[PDB]
Amino acid sequence: GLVVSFYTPATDGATFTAIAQRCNQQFGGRFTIAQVSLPRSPNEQRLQLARRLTGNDRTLDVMALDVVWTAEFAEAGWALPLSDDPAGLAENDAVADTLPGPLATAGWNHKLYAAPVTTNTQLLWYRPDLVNSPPTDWNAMIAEAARLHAAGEPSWIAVQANQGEGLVVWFNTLLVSAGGSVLSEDGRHVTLTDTPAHRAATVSALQILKSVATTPGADPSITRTEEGSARLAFEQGKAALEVNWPFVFASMLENAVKGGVPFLPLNRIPQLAGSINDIGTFTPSDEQFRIAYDASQQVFGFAPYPAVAPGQPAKVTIGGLNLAVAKTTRHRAEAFEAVRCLRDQHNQRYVSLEGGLPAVRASLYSDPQFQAKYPMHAIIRQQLTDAAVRPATPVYQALSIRLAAVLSPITEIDPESTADELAAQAQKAIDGM
Numbered sequence: 001g002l003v004v005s006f007y008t009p010a011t012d013g014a015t016f017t018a019i020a021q022r023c024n025q026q027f028g029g030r031f032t033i034a035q036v037s038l039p040r041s042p043n044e045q046r047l048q049l050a051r052r053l054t055g056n057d058r059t060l061d062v063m064a065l066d067v068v069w070t071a072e073f074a075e076a077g078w079a080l081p082l083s084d085d086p087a088g089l090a091e092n093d094a095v096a097d098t099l100p101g102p103l104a105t106a107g108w109n110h111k112l113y114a115a116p117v118t119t120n121t122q123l124l125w126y127r128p129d130l131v132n133s134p135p136t137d138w139n140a141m142i143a144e145a146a147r148l149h150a151a152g153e154p155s156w157i158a159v160q161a162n163q164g165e166g167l168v169v170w171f172n173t174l175l176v177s178a179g180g181s182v183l184s185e186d187g188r189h190v191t192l193t194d195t196p197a198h199r200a201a202t203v204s205a206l207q208i209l210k211s212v213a214t215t216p217g218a219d220p221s222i223t224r225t226e227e228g229s230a231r232l233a234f235e236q237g238k239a240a241l242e243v244n245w246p247f248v249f250a251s252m253l254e255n256a257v258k259g260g261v262p263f264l265p266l267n268r269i270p271q272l273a274g275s276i277n278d279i280g281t282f283t284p285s286d287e288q289f290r291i292a293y294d295a296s297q298q299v300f301g302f303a304p305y306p307a308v309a310p311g312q313p314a315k316v317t318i319g320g321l322n323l324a325v326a327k328t329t330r331h332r333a334e335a336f337e338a339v340r341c342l343r344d345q346h347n348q349r350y351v352s353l354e355g356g357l358p359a360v361r362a363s364l365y366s367d368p369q370f371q372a373k374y375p376m377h378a379i380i381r382q383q384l385t386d387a388a389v390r391p392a393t394p395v396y397q398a399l400s401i402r403l404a405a406v407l408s409p410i411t412e413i414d415p416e417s418t419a420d421e422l423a424a425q426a427q428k429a430i431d432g433m
């Protein structure tokens with residue numbers, strides 16, 4: 001029958017292709033979901049969708065949106081409200097058995113405009129064979145990197161952050177962890193420097209960025225304009241401390257079994273031969289998972305994101321993907337039916353355990369069979385419960401571009417003057433209404 005197109009980030013395309021294929025067996029031949037890839041970069045993801053939306057591409061049906069695009073797509077009319085489902089089932093489905101943090105990212109002006117499908121929060125990943133106890137706060141991270149450099153050990157702090165959205169995410173986490181905020185609750189005022197407490201938070205965050213950027217043994221890549229991968233730096237043994245989203249867990253086991261991780265030669269364990277399937281994905285039996293995870297524990301550990309204020313946890317910026325029905329769709333009923341099928345319990349287990357993307361269904365985090373394959377589950381749920389959020393505003397794309405340009409390169413941050421420049425650039429973004 002008809003085709004429901006399903007646009008997703010390219011890096012997640014294989015995972016969502018698998019989910020769509022499962023969802024296509026359950027539709028009685030009434031319709032088919034066809035996954036289509038978008039570039040890497042949240043901003044260029046959005047750009048491609050916005051061109052199709054303003055050009056009235058009537059073949060565009062369902063979109064996997066970064067959590068920061070809700071306000072823009074809702075206010076533009078590009079994402080239909082879930083109440084536009086002709087069956088009237090979308091809103092109840094979106095909230096049922098779903099964590100509240102993700103749901104907050106899917107709303108605008110008191111209505112839902114998307115159904116959460118994946119969420120995200122960053123953890124500390126470390127080498128337990130080199131780092132005796134994982135740092136609990138950022139001054140401790142700095143000290144550990146220095147101690148490693150002095151011992152001749154890998155000294156990079158690999159943070160998934162170059163000159164774009166990941167850098168804005170890191171800054172947002174530090175800022176909110178210190179008690180600040182980019183914008184006011186209603187999104188209409190810049191609150192980086194408007195009170196002494198807010199200015200103090202912004203300065204504290206900038207001081208941490210600058211300190212990490214200039215630790216002895218820091219990555220020479222910080223200053224340049226090119227793109228590096230924290231995940232790959234750690235897998236290659238260039239860093240013993242990494243701050244990243246939890247997809248690095250699935251990556252570490254898979255690439256180790258393939259032979260791509262020098263300090264974790266799972267490719268030399270006979271019991272793991274053939275645990276890569278014929279499309280290249282690590283798909284272990286229960287016993288193979290136990291063998292690979294036990295081996296990995298010697299060289300790979302995880303821990304909460306480091307705090308800014310010692311003594312209590314960080315407030316970690318939430319990430320993820322929400323499923324929205326485009327206003328261009330010719331088939332609203334089937335597009336909303338597809339959204340419900342894409343986020344069902346079976347496909348949520350799959351998106352976390354094979355795709356590396358945290359599920360949004362609360363039940364999974366209370367499910368011992370899921371917990372046995374997703375060992376980070378408790379820290380992830382804790383960090384999603386008291387999460388920082390990036391500002392929700394229709395001009396987010398312009399705000400993030402202006403913020404990232406001030407922050408980058410982080411070696412050139414000077415906390416007091418950079419704080420004022422940030423506030424002035426943020427103000428230009430929201431002055432564009």
Ligand SMILES: O[C@@H]1[C@@H](O)[C@@H](O[C@H]2O[C@H](CF)[C@@H](O)[C@@H](O)[C@@H]2O)O[C@H](CF)[C@H]1O
Nearest residue numbers: 009042067120165166169245247319320
């Ligand atoms: O498509 C990928 C995605 O771009 C990127 O997304 C994550 O970082 C972004 C940049 F900070 C956040 O804006 C986003 O919210 C958050 O999920 O890494 C994911 C895997 F962790 C991928 O699935």
